[PDB]
Each structure stands twice: as C-alpha cells, then as structure tokens.
Amino acid sequence: QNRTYIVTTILEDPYVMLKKNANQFEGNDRYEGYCVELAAEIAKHVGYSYRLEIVSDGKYGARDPDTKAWNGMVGELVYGRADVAVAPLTITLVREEVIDFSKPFMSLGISIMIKKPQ
C-alpha cells in the first residue's frame, strides 16, 4: 500500500481551523479551512493519501543564527519528519535554498488597515 504522506500545517484562521465539536470527529475530518481543501484537491490530482498534523512549535520555519537549526515546519520538512507542507509559507531566499517550493497559489502583499469610517 502506498504510504500515507505526512502533511504539516499550522493554526491560522482561515487557512486551518478546528471544526465545531472537535472531540466529535477524529483525524483530518476535524480540520476545516482553505488549506485543508487545497490539500484535498492536490492529493486528488497527484493521487496519494495524506494524514494531517500540526507543527508543535507552532511557528513558521526559521533558523537559529548560531545553532544553525530550523525552528518550524521547515524543520519538520528538511529533517525528514514531514513529506509536504500545506500552509501560508512565505517564499523567501533562505528557505528556497533548503526547500523546494511550488509556484505561488496565493499572491500577496503588504497593505494598509484603517478604522472603518462610520
């Protein structure tokens, strides 16, 4: 049987959230969000079964300047813990050297937030 591929994610609404009555459902069925359906479609097109989880550190990848060790989903990827990451990973030079990204599924930018004029 083709091995289940381990997917790393992170809690950040709406990308990944816990479905109402989490204890009721187990496994992937308890997770609801944009990234979950994206992973569903991607695995459907590739044709592999996946099991979700969450980065315990709860932080996006970053290296310790002195320890030279990655802290986050990048770590769970480059250290063999995880087989793919489906989350809002910003594309950067530091990560692109030690990780193989994909063409952006969501373009993005810095923007201005103000009080809604009553």
């Binding site: 030079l93 692109e96 050297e97 063409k103 952006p104 373009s107």
Partner: protein
C-alpha cells in the same frame, strides 16, 4: 415682500415658521452651490467589477482569441459568469483583435467602453500621452511573469535565487518605478470659471 401679512396669532405662527424654513433653505442652497463651484469632484462610475456587470450603459470586452477570454469562459464565479453571458450575447462585437484596437476604442468613445486587460499594460498606458485613461478596481485574477529555462539547464536554481534576492532587497520595485511611473509623462488648482448660459 407681501401685499398682506397675517394679523392673527395663528396665521403669524404659520408665517414665522415658513419664514425660518425659507431662510434656512435658501442659505443652504447658496452655500452648497458655492461648495460645488469651488471644489471639482469627478466620480468614476465604476470602482469594482460587480458595478460593471450590473451596469448596461457601459460596454466591455476582451481581446478575441486570448487567455482573458478563455478565463472568462471557463469561470465559476457568479460575476464573471454574468460577464461571459453578456459578452457572448453582445451586439456589436465587444471583442477586439488587438490591444491597440481596444485602447483606441476606449479612447474614441466617452465612458461607454471599458477594456479588460493585464494590470501592467494598463498601468503603463495610464501614464502615456494622451493621459486619457485610468485603471479601476482591483484584480480579477492572479498571474506572474517568470524567467524560463530548458529542462535540465544548470541555470534554474541560480536564477530562482537571483529573482528572490532581488525581490527581497527591492530591485524589481525600483525598476518598475523607473519604467512605469518614472520615465512616465504625466505624474499624479485650475482657476475658477465664470458661469455659462
């Protein structure tokens, strides 16, 4: 004035309140007219795409036999489905054979034609002489322009890292400013005119 004024308290009450009303209303009319004549404000009829679908006075079409039409055709969003219905049931042909044809069609008309195109060329043209066009609303699709390479070339990883480094430091933004806004003819007060007949 008046050839007659009321003598009873009730008629005088009516007249007084009418007088107050008249005073306020005439003052307001004059003041708001002064505002209008002092500050020119030109409102674009459109600030989005749904506004464009609801409107029927304004016509809009893409370039015929292109990727934009292919996008609108295979769409699943409601607004773009409505736009596709319109463009498929439009007389005459909203579509066009060349970009310059669409630009000329927009310019010759007066607020009747709206052209759907790429953000970059639109931003460029909004800075060309004649500066008689502008871009409105957000973007209806996401795309990117990418450096290409043959399969197996040793230049893939270096160019990827080069574009990423340039983006992070800010070179590409500077070049865009240089070739779109700077090196751009029109950048980004007129005495008041006497009223005409």
């Amino acid at each position: 004035g008046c050839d007659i004024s009321p003598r009873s308290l009730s008629g005088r009450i009516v007249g007084g309140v009418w007088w107050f009303f008249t005073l306020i209303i005439i003052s307001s009319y004059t003041a708001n007219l002064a505002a209008f004549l002092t500050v020119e404000r030109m409102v674009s009829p459109i600030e989005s795409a749904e506004d464009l679908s609801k409107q029927t006075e304004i016509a809009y079409g893409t370039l015929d036999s292109g990727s934009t039409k292919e996008f609108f055709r295979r769409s699943k969003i409601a607004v773009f489905d409505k736009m596709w219905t319109y463009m498929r049931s439009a007389e005459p042909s909203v579509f066009v054979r060349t970009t310059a044809e669409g630009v000329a069609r927009v310019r010759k008309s007066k607020g009747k034609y709206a052209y759907l195109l790429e953000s970059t060329m639109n931003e460029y043209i909004e800075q060309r002489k004649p500066c008689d066009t502008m871009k409105v609303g957000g973007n209806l699709d996401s795309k990117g322009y990418g450096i290409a390479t043959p399969k197996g070339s040793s230049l893939g990883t270096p160019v990827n890292l080069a574009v990423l480094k340039l983006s992070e430091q800010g070179v590409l933004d500077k070049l865009k400013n240089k070739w779109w806004y700077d090196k751009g003819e029109c950048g980004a007060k007129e005495k008041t005119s006497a009223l005409s007949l």
